[PDB]
Symmetry: C3
Subunit: 383 residues, 3 copies
Amino acid sequence: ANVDEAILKRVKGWAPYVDAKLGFRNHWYPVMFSKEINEGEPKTLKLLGENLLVNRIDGKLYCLKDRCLHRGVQLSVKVECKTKSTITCWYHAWTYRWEDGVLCDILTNPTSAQIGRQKLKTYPVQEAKGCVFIYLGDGDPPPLARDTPPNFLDDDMEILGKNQIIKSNWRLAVENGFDPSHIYIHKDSILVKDNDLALPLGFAPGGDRKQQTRVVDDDVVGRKGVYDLIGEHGVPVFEGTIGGEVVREGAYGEKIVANDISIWLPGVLKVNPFPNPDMMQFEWYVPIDENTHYYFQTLGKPCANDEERKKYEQEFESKWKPMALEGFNNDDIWAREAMVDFYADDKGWVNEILFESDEAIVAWRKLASEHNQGIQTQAHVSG
Amino acid sequence: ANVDEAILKRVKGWAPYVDAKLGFRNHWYPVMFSKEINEGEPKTLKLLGENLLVNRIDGKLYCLKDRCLHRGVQLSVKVECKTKSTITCWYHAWTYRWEDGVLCDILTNPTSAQIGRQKLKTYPVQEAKGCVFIYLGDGDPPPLARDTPPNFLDDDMEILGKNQIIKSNWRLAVENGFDPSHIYIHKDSILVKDNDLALPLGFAPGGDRKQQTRVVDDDVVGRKGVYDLIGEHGVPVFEGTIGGEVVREGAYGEKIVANDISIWLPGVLKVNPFPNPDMMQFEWYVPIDENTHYYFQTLGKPCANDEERKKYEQEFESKWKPMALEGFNNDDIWAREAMVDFYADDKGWVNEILFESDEAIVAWRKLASEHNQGIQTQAHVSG
Amino acid sequence: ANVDEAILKRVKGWAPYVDAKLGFRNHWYPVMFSKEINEGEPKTLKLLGENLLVNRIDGKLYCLKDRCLHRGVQLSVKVECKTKSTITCWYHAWTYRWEDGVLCDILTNPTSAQIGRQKLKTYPVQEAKGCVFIYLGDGDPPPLARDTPPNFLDDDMEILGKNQIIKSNWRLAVENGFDPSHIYIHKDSILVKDNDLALPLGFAPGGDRKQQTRVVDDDVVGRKGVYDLIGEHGVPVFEGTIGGEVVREGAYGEKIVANDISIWLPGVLKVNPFPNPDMMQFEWYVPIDENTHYYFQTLGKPCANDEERKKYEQEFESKWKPMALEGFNNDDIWAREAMVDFYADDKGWVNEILFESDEAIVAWRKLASEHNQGIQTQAHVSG
Ligand code: FES
Ligand code: FES
Ligand code: FES
Ligand SMILES: [Fe+2]
Ligand SMILES: [Fe+2]
Ligand SMILES: [Mg+2]
Ligand SMILES: [Mg+2]
Ligand SMILES: [Mg+2]
């Protein structure tokens, strides 16, 4: 539906992933932090290509599509919230209920036969760990835990993070994240120097294809994921050679990080431990449109009480955010960007030449192709 | 000719209107004010997608296509008017007469077989009421009166105005203007409060469908238009309600305006009286290209003589222009622009959900569809 | 392929020229000066739509395609030359030899089965007269002399120049440079006044529509060009008339220049003498992409020794560069740009109306259609 048929035909093993340029419908996605949306101060955003309005009413979050049923304007051009439970289009005053999207009045014509017979699309929203998730799908949603990685929701896990808009397709972000050889780009990171990380240049793989990863398509709550096992079973490269001469070495630090690396639908990576042996990183690459994503980064640490939490917050602002979320992951941002040209006409999916460590990426494309809950298309966007 | 055939088959009530992205060929259009073009100072503009040159020679206006027949450059890049009656292309000196577009000379080759055998396209041009109108069409033009609203050309009507370029398709602008319910957006206007206008929020429509409008396809000079009669049979709504609670109002005003409202081919709105009970407003939404229009605003006041026009003038400059043309209509500008995205891909014409006050708009779309003098296409722009 | 068949069928005699929007493959093109490319300091450029990396290694120049075989990134986003004879991709460290493009190592996986089984595209590169030429084609190159105008390579000919990126398609630049009547645009040039050039407004042909050009098919080096003879055989126009009245005069002058004017594949103009009797101008219009070219300008002067070269360089910097290359050719820059719109949708190639002096341009279009060594396409830009 999104990609030229010629191209889709020529990718067989994961064609629906190739098609999912706008992301996967019927999943939850984080879009902002809870502290970024205040009582009665609606925020606008784009997700899976659809513009959305999110408001907080009596502490609770609601989501309406930011497109009036009448002439298709964004309501957010001029927000008119005249009662606590409704929003009034600025143009001809069609008035919708935030709770169910029902067109419940029209100030310019109280007699209209439309009133009570139309419904603006709404989306479920839920807050968890200080993060706003929108279920960008139809019908009653599954629990949040299905579309989060293991441990993200643990009672004791304190989540902090950072969000920004990145100009690449979401899949280029996912694949960069889950790619075992990409760690080559991080070899000069200030995190690696200053936090004394052990970091190989990459890994020589051992065993055949199926041993490189482990698919998790079971799971209690229905999570679908892939664990990368390359560097559990492979030989780390610490001395990179060209024609037999050592030209570059890996980082010989003392802290062991990234023992477990996994990727989960709808597109969230878990790195454990990281950036320190006590923490986890959970980052989402959230489809905004064809060319754009939210890079929704979080760092988790278990905390039993409240002064732990206060200690963690101060470590986050002074150390983990600048050193790791920026100083390590910035190189990820421009690596994603650098893949844009080759994949932008959709021909990179056919012309790429993969090698052995891309086994993890192929597993991901397969898992996503068969376990996503729907392919967002242009018909979902303009409909 | 301009829109996907699948879309045209779904808007059968008014398909040629939806097709008319560039506007309607074979009508007169105002493009500037007479006083903005001085003797021997050609001006450049784009109309219906076509770049044009207008010049004032011995006080008479002339219009040539601003595209040399030879290599297709705009002559306006470097104007060379070497005699009063001619223009010489800056590139190889092909020289045209303003009066008939004939290639009368070539300075670079005075023996060319082309000389006297080629003709650059010219368009009729006429000045009335201090406005420059160009007949963007072929053959013998009609009287200007066919393509202007009633009273505009009355002998004592003094016209004053303002022109600017707005980034929406001309149809967005026409429909916004003729929309009986859009006046919602004007509820906080400075004009409404400072000139004691009795402006409702909308109208509960009364009587039957056929009574909401009155098509004029029966004017003796050949005018084609639609009167909006929603305020004749309908009830004005001055109190805005949601759930039976008053949330908004029309407030304090004694002056009745805009009881006479009509839209006329090729796309000009008449509102009478407005902005005061002794004036009327005529405004055009002139297609520049697919994405742009001139918003050619005029105010008409009947004036007996030279002194009465001077008093109209002072008052236009100090009160009516800042308060009404700018103050009141600025909201119209941002409303048009807010419909751009919905209609950009031609999908809005199928996906809109109209209500009762949009009878006026539908009547216009049918009128435009039936009585236009041709659809401008890209083949007219290029060839 | 690059152009619609409904246009190509309408330009019989020169359709391969109209199709060659990206230029002609399998020719040498100049892209920069020798001094701009130093030992061990790779430079990036785009040629025939392809991103290329050039490097200097032990004085010798090499050219690799700037696109990794793995995931299609430009290597030049972060250049990593880890040994003299190789470049290592910054992403997963696939490592290529400059000399043959072979994938000789991967730092991230020294056991990959890709090593020694993939080859990145290379192109021959050669330096002549201080200018770097890349053979943008396949297989073994021809001699450089085939794709350079007569006398550019003469032993005594000292070459100085200037290069810049211009936003027009390359063909518009070529046609402007070889166009006999375009000299009309140069009529007010300071060069013309200050160096007392004889410069007519144009030339009325001397007789038949078949003695205006001389096609050079022969030439033992294999060069393919057209000489413009109108200047030698026509009647110069020094008094331009409209309605029989003189409106403009040409520039009288002592110095006769541009006796010998020729255009050569792949798109290089030779003007002799110019801008003074003992000098020549050779300029290339080198396709970068569909909308852009390098304007690669050179002036040749025979210099017997170092004192003559030194004298020439001072005169170049103080006068010829500012007065001729900048002052005089600046009007050719905007003349090219002014043709963009008409030819942008490919319709100008059908809608243009040619006159007698365009016989030169037509002879060039047919020559180029005949003797080009292949049309560059998007598929070559990809694969
Ligand atoms: S566009 Fe929202 S009420 Fe008309
Ligand atoms: S383009 Fe106008 S005379 Fe050649
Ligand atoms: S993209 Fe160059 S090595 Fe992976
Ligand atoms: Fe990374
Ligand atoms: Fe309005
Ligand atoms: Mg709800
Ligand atoms: Mg005329
Ligand atoms: Mg002179």
